[PDB]
């Protein structure tokens, strides 16, 4: 009921309304300009663009592995992170960012990571064997079936189970390119929502 309390609910909802807008833009393979997002998403809170865009771009790079690339002006185009070819749209929710998360988890346990170690990373993010996550789908089936035939992963016995990078994963990115995407994002500038006094000062 409080105004500043209803403010961050409006910002948090414009973050999820811009993100779900850009996903509609990436699926159509169009270009996005700053004028479009102002007029057709955050028409009311335009001067908040550096923070709703910054918190939506960051909510794409890491959730769906989609990168907002400014062509440089004020024009942006949507591509996949580390330049992969798979997203999972066959056009709702890209599964690229979860792939890139699984890859970097093996990249840190060495050549191969145990099935146990993989699930434990996936369990902390709300994705559980035998539970259809809404955005990602069934995890066990998508990890095993989907990414084995796509040649992104390997799944073999003990000599327990384990995961290794596949031929297509090594062809489109590297251990060093993933481990630096993890470092660049772990060292990002963290955006904080503005108060009402702050947001009004910028005018």
């Amino acid at each position: 009921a409080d105004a500043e309390s209803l403010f961050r609910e409006a910002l948090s909802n414009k973050v999820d309304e811009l993100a779900h807008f850009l996903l509609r833009k990436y699926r159509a393979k169009e270009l996005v300009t700053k004028a479009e997002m102002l007029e057709r998403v955050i028409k009311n809170y335009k001067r908040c663009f550096p923070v709703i865009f910054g918190k939506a771009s960051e909510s794409l790079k890491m959730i769906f592995g989609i990168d907002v690339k400014e062509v440089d002006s004020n024009t942006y185009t949507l591509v996949t992170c580390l330049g992969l070819s798979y997203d999972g749209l066959l056009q709702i929710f890209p599964k690229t960012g979860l792939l890139i998360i699984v890859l970097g988890t093996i990249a840190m346990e060495g050549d191969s990571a145990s099935e146990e170690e993989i699930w434990e990373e996936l369990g902390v993010m709300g994705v559980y064997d035998g539970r259809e996550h809404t955005v990602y789908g069934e995890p066990r089936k998508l990890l095993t079936q989907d990414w084995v035939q796509e040649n992104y992963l390997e799944y073999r016995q003990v000599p327990r189970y384990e995961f290794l990078w596949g031929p297509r994963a090594l062809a489109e990115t590297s251990y060093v390119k993933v481990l630096e995407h993890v470092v660049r994002v772990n060292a990002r500038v963290r955006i904080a929502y503005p108060s009402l006094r702050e947001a009004a000062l910028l005018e």
Partner: peptide, 7 residues
Amino acid sequence: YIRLYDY
């Protein structure tokens, strides 16, 4: 929660 990049 993703414990790769803390977000």
